[PDB]
Structure 1
Amino acid sequence: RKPPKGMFLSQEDVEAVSANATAATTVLRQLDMELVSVKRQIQNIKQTNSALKEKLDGGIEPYRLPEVI
């Protein structure tokens, strides 16, 4: 009834990998590319966040007022 635990095999995926002689290679490369595409997207945001953090340097300390108790 089921694949071994941890093994993945769907009807949908088998069809994709066996559609033609080089269908598998195509599937795996298109995934290698999606991966690079996401990694560069990460470095990009990391770089942007790093700049935004540099603007908050010092926080809001010099702008705080004592409490009127």
Structure 2
Amino acid sequence: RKPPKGMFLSQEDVEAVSANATAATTVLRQLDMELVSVKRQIQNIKQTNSALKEKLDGGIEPYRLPEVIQKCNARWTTEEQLLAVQAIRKYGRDFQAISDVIGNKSVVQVKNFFVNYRRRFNIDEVLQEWEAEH
């Protein structure tokens, strides 16, 4: 039932290497060709990838800014409320962004904010404007 382990002998394969005096030579040059293609196509992408790596050279170290390490707070200052309305205008529902921008608020506090102030900061309206843009 079983060929020796690691010998490969498909029905389909056999009919191919036999059905002409040189069909072996066909099949084996054709794979040899395709092998060269694929080894060239590797050469292309190596050269491309190496050029792209030259463009990244330096990383992004010159551009990173230190981060706002800041404890949350029960109290909304007027500053904080005004930041928030503006973040809403820029970021729609993305609450995590909004908490980054404000920097003394958790994502929960933010979410409650949408609810408390909904009426007074016409938050509906604000969102309608962010939607109408994106």
Please give the TM-score of this superposition, normalised by the length of structure 1.
0.94
- Dislocated runs of 4+, deviation >4 Å: none
| Matched residue, 1:60 | 60
Alpha-carbon distance in structure 1 between the residues aligned to 2:17 and 2:5: 21
Q: CA deviation at 1:62?
A: 0.3
RMSD: 4.7
Give yes or no for the alignment of 1:40 onto 2:40: yes
The Cα offsets for residues 41-62 of structure 1, whole Å up to 9 and x where unpaired, read as 0000000000000000000000
Q: Give unpaired runs (5+ residues) of structure 2.
A: 67-132
Greater relative contact order: 1 or 2 (C-alpha under 8 angstroms, separation 6 or more)? Answer: 2
C-alpha separation in 1, matches of 2:50 and 2:24: 39
Distance between the aligned counterparts of 1:64 and 1:37, measured in 2? Answer: 42
Return the index of the structure with the highest Cα Rg.
2
Separation in structure 2 between the aligned mates of residue 56 and residue 19 of structure 1, nearest angstrom: 54
Q: Which residue of 2 aligns with 1:21?
A: 21
The percent of aligned pairs where both chains have the same amino acid is 97
In 2, Cα distance between the equivalents of 1:3 and 1:58?
A: 56
Distance 1:9 1:62 in 2: 60
Residues in 1 aligned to 2:58 and 2:19: alpha-carbon distance in whole angstroms: 59
Deviation at 1:29, TM superposition (A): 0.2
Q: Tell me by how many angstroms 1:26 deviates.
A: 0.3
Aligned residue-pair number? 68
Unaligned runs of 5+ in 1: none
Instruction: Please give the per-residue CA displacement for 1:20-47, whole angstroms capped at 9, x wherever unaligned.
Output: 0000000000000000000000000000
